[PDB]
């Protein structure tokens, strides 16, 4: 069921064939041997060069990879170009930090001398989503490639060209076959891969449904995992928030990638005094959305990645309204072949409303009204999610104080989400566990090998 | 059923009542509320003091807690005193490193100000084994207590007195009720606990069967886990090994805690040149064993923890022989009420013999003969386990170079296994994943909360 179906026109561009049991078997043995090869010999310097090379090609053919993502899951070409740029950076980052992150860590003891090596463990299985085709892969491929963990990837069924093309990208960079292999497999084959003794760990970014499913199979086979699940991020606006600056980030905060971002600012928490003012501003901002062809430079709102996604976001809005939510803006159906959903804003949300605790992976602004910081922090923590979130206050000492009181994995001050090579990314609760990127992400599947020498 | 049956006499000394469903419900709610209290307001100093107090009491009543373990799982009283000493240590270590370890981490980035907080996450379920009643508990309790994660313990059924007394110990130290609670629950209840939204993680130490079951349930519920399973450590004696030292550590290496140590030196790998020389030495060492009353200072070999335990080891010895292994020494049945198994040595194991790959949790020396150093590394790695291991050589750099080629979590140079609060403990493969102790085990269930302020 792997097809590239352009979200703008809804026309199938390419259909890919599944991988067979034998094919999969061959892929794992190749990967396993490569792991052993990198364990016996020191090919580190080579992988570094190959990783830099990957960055160069991406830079060189940036527009080519960008369009592939647009035609695959229908996001703005300009955004796609941006994703690519972040990828070039994640790649150069680990290729540069390679030696530092891999050197031995000495330990302090009176009993003698001790330290630990950062070694590779084996073949890693990566399960990724469609919202950020290349970023989702590079986020975990770059670190493990440096470490020496061959990788096998099972991407989303709607972005097969990006998954396939990423493998070629790495090969074209001079990487040995098996460094990373894309797998057009079913979920039954995924459980087989996990159950294979040649696979040592699994890193999955996606939905709770799949996360629970994979994590369970992973745990049944004693395999280590890291889950990067969804978010229902709280964008808190304190009394001293800068509104001229606030106006500059709002569009991006909730309409970037049509709202299909795990760290999207799904929940807007605003004070009683600012409630009306905010409704006007969010509305003013949502009105500037120019939807249309995602390849066109002047389009600012892309269509959702699939007909199902659109159906889901709409059902969610409906449900909200059926339970008391107030329709502040949008909600008008769009007439066009594309999987479009116009920006919509809802408020008047209460705890007895199921949407209050649900994540809407679309262009839907949600306004929550509180009477104080205490209440803001309370609403913010009243969630099964804990990925990101934002604190808006001109006083940074103040924003920091509040942020630390939020049960979440990340807090962005006076801005929407941001991802960088050096910054760790992950969350808590139903948003998963484990951190990606930075140095914490580098060691997820590293074997801390202790060498102890007593006196 | 949770019962204390002295392994020496096989007499029932205690019979505890299983925890009721409502009792379980109340415990988790108390733990949840306590977690919230420590998350909303700082009580680190109080916890530090109380942990130091736990150490003080242990120091004071060492012999009382030692006898408890001996009567619970039958270990030598002197070994138990040693255990308590290691607990006192772990406790003080974490109380002393508290501030340092819980310190925020700055992040280098030229795009803005960034750092991450180390925060508590919730209630942790701990499943610990019987081979080290107190040590096993302290390994995870100390770090998590300082962190601020209340804890619920599910200990082995054969050492309920230990499990229960440890909770009392913590309450005596002054720690608020809920810091750690012992649960005399069934495995169905353990499953319920794992499914509870109040529990945020699971750290288990035990068998593969239990681990798979527990990790499977944890995964189905998105709960992070760390597993400390068995081992079959390779004790490699290089060509330049010093036999004076070798002789001094041999008894401890395999007969400490009667061989019931995950890091016991289960697989001795020697060169042809030293094969017969080693068979004599190991035999000489094993002959010095004096089994008897564990409370008696004279005793140098304790009975196993249970009848089933003995039955199992005896079967493994039998199985090895029925498949070709050679009986180098012992194997004779001890006529006595206790669960005694006389020290035994076997050799001539081949890949076609099941025992070649099985871990024996008893006083059974195993000898593997190799013709080269490379073959030694091969046999060492030809294992489904990868916990610890020892490299014996008079050349430090040589020993360190060989260690690095072993696929294991810990390597001990010129010595048997050791465990200090500053040293990370953990392995790879079927030995599990994750680490305990040192700073690494500290952050296992910690929330790295990124705070990001762009320029």
| CATH code for the domain of B144 | 3.40.605.10
Per the listing, tokens 């196993």 go with B304
Specify the pairing of strand A199-205 against strand A123-127. Answer: parallel
- Chain B: closest CA distance from residue A450 (Å): 5
Mutate to test the interface with B, among A253, A450, A451, A454 (most CBs of B within 10 A): A450
Tell me whether residues A215 and B212 touch, CB distance under 8 A.
no
Closest A-chain CA to B397:
A453
Helix (H) or strand (E) holding B320: helix B307-322
Closest A-chain CA to B207:
A222
Measured in angstroms, the resolution is 2.4
Whole-angstrom distance, CA of residue A452 vs CA of residue B129? 25
Mutate to test the interface with B, among A449, A454, A455 (most CBs of B within 10 A): A449
Same domain for A219 and A243?
no
- Chain B: closest CA distance from residue A350 (Å): 22
Structure-block tokens of residue A129: 């989503």
Structure-block tokens of residue B275: 């094969």
Same domain for B75 and B26?
yes
Closest A-chain CA to B435:
A448
Structure-block tokens of residue A31: 């990967």
- Chain B: closest CA distance from residue A273 (Å): 26
- Name the catalytic one among A228, A366, A373, A436: A228
Domain that holds residue B341: 231-420
Tell me whether residues A448 and B454 touch, CB distance under 8 A.
no
Same domain for A409 and A358?
yes
Same domain for A92 and A104?
yes
Q: Obtained via which technique?
A: X-ray
- Is A87 a residue of the active site? no
Per the listing, tokens 């733990």 go with B31
Same domain for B196 and B242?
no
| Residue B64: partners with Cβ closer than 8 Å, 6 or more residues away | none
Per the listing, tokens 């459980």 go with A191
Q: Is B214 helix (H, G, I), strand (E, B) or coil?
A: helix
Helix (H) or strand (E) holding B211: helix B208-220
Chain B CB contacts of A418 under 8 Å are 452, 454
Residues B429 and B388: beta-carbon distance below 8 Å: no
Strands (E), B112-266: 112-119, 123-127, 151-154, 180-182, 199-205, 224-228, 234-237
Q: Is B21 helix (H, G, I), strand (E, B) or coil?
A: helix
Burial class (CB in 10 A: 0-12, 13-18, 19+), B236: buried
Closest A-chain CA to B400:
A451
Same domain for B141 and B277?
no
Same domain for B247 and B136?
no
Structure-block tokens of residue A261: 């971002």
User: Which 8-state DSSP code applies to residue A355?
Assistant: G
CATH number at residue B403: 3.40.309.10
Q: Output the CA–CA distances (angstroms, integers) from residue A131 to A137, A404, A416, A431, B152, in the order listed.
A: 11, 28, 17, 16, 39
Q: Is B330 helix (H, G, I), strand (E, B) or coil?
A: coil
Which one of B413, B432, B449 has the shortest CB-CB distance to A411?
A: B449
Nearest to A60 by CA among A78, A85, A93, A80: A85
Whole-angstrom distance, CA of residue A289 vs CA of residue A298? 10
Tell me whether residues B200 and A229 touch, CB distance under 8 A.
no
Chain A CB contacts of B117 under 8 Å are 404
Residues A3 and A12: beta-carbon distance below 8 Å: yes
| Residue B337: partners with Cβ closer than 8 Å, 6 or more residues away | B8, B9, B10
Helix (H) or strand (E) holding B48: helix B44-60
Tell me whether residues B208 and A222 touch, CB distance under 8 A.
yes
Same domain for B305 and B415?
yes
- Is B168 a residue of the active site? no
Torsion, Cα B4 B149 A226 B422, to 10 degrees, reads -80
Same domain for A253 and A310?
yes
| Residue A119: partners with Cβ closer than 8 Å, 6 or more residues away | A39, A148, A446, A447, A449, B404
Which one of B109, B215, B399 has the shortest CB-CB distance to A420?
A: B109
Nearest to B194 by CA among B225, B163, B157, B160: B225
Same domain for B408 and B444?
no
Helix (H) or strand (E) holding A368: strand A364-370
Same domain for B124 and B260?
no
Whole-angstrom distance, CA of residue A319 vs CA of residue B239? 74
| Residue B408: partners with Cβ closer than 8 Å, 6 or more residues away | A449, B233, B234, B380, B386, B387, B388, B389, B427, B428, B431
- Name the catalytic one among B128, B167, B228, B359: B228
Tell me whether residues A222 and B216 touch, CB distance under 8 A.
no
Going across the sheet that includes B151-154, the strands are B180-182, B151-154, B123-127, B199-205, B224-228, B432-433
Closest A-chain CA to B41:
A405
| Residue A168: partners with Cβ closer than 8 Å, 6 or more residues away | none
Closest A-chain CA to B120:
A407
Helix (H) or strand (E) holding B277: helix B272-287
Residues B361 and B206: beta-carbon distance below 8 Å: no
Residues B189 and B183: beta-carbon distance below 8 Å: yes
CA angle A20, A22, A23 (to 5 degrees): 65
Whole-angstrom distance, CA of residue B439 vs CA of residue B449? 17
Query: How many distinct structural domains can be found in chain B?
Result: 2
CB pairs A-B closer than 8 Å: 174
Which one of B39, B200, B451 has the shortest CB-CB distance to A403?
A: B451
- Name the catalytic one among A83, A203, A262, A366: A262
Mutate to test the interface with A, among B392, B451, B454, B455 (most CBs of A within 10 A): B451
Same domain for B445 and B375?
no
Q: Output the CA–CA distances (angstroms, integers) from residue B216 to A140, A194, A229, A353, B183, in the order listed.
A: 24, 13, 18, 33, 20
Nearest to B302 by CA among B352, B265, B336, B346: B336
Q: Which residues pair with B268 in a beta bridge?
A: B235, B367
Whole-angstrom distance, CA of residue A282 vs CA of residue B136? 55
Residues for chain B: how many in total? 455
- Chain B: closest CA distance from residue A179 (Å): 21
């Amino acid at each position: 069921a792997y097809q590239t179906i352009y979200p703008y026109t809804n026309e199938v561009l390419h259909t890919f064939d599944n991988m067979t049991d034998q094919g999969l078997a061959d892929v794992l043995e190749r990967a396993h041997l490569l792991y052993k090869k990198w364990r016996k010999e020191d090919h580190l310097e080579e992988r570094k060069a190959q990783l830099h090379q990957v960055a160069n090609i991406l830079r060189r053919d940036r527009d080519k990879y960008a369009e592939i993502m647009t035609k695959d899951m229908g996001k703005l070409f300009t955004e796609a170009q941006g994703e690519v740029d972040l990828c070039a950076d994640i790649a150069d980052y680990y290729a540069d930090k390679a030696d530092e992150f891999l050197m031995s860590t000495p330990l302090e003891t009176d009993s003698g001398q001790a330290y630990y090596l950062k070694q590779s463990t084996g073949v890693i299985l990566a399960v990724e989503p469609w919202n950020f085709p290349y970023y989702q892969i590079m986020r975990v491929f770059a670190p493990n490639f440096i470490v020496g963990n061959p990788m096998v990837l099972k991407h989303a069924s709607i972005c097969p060209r990006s998954a396939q093309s990423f493998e070629e990208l790495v090969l074209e960079a001079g990487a040995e076959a098996g460094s990373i292999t894309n797998l057009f497999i079913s979920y039954d084959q995924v459980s087989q891969v996990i159950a294979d003794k040649r696979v040592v760990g699994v890193c999955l970014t996606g939905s709770e449904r799949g996360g629970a499913s994979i994590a369970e199979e992973a745990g049944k086979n004693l395999k280590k995992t890291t889950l990067e699940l969804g978010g229902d991020d709280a964008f808190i606006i304190l009394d001293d928030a800068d509104w001229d600056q606030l106006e500059k980030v709002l569009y991006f905060s909730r309409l970037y990638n049509a709202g299909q971002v795990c760290t999207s600012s799904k929940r807007f928490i605003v004070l009683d005094k600012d409630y009306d003012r905010f409704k006007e501003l969010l509305t003013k901002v949502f009105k500037t959305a120019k939807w249309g062809d995602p390849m066109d430079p002047e389009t600012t709102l892309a269509p959702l990645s699939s007909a199902q996604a659109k159906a889901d976001v709409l059902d969610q809005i409906k449900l909200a309204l059926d339970h008391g939510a107030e329709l502040v803006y949008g909600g008008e159906a769009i007439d066009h072949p594309g999987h479009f959903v116009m920006p919509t804003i809802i408020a008047g949300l209460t705890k007895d409303n199921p949407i209050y605790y649900q994540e809407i992976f679309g262009p839907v602004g949600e306004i929550y009204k509180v009477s104080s910081e205490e209440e803001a922090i309370e609403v913010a923590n009243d969630s099964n999610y804990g990925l990101g979130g934002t604190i808006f206050s001109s006083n940074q000492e103040h924003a920091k104080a509040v942020a630390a009181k939020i049960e979440t994995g990340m807090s962005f001050i006076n801005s929407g989400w941001t991802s960088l090579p050096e910054l760790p990314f992950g969350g808590i609760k139903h948003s998963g566990y484990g951190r990606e990127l930075s140095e914490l992400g580098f060691t997820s599947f590293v074997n801390e090998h202790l060498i102890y020498i007593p006196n």
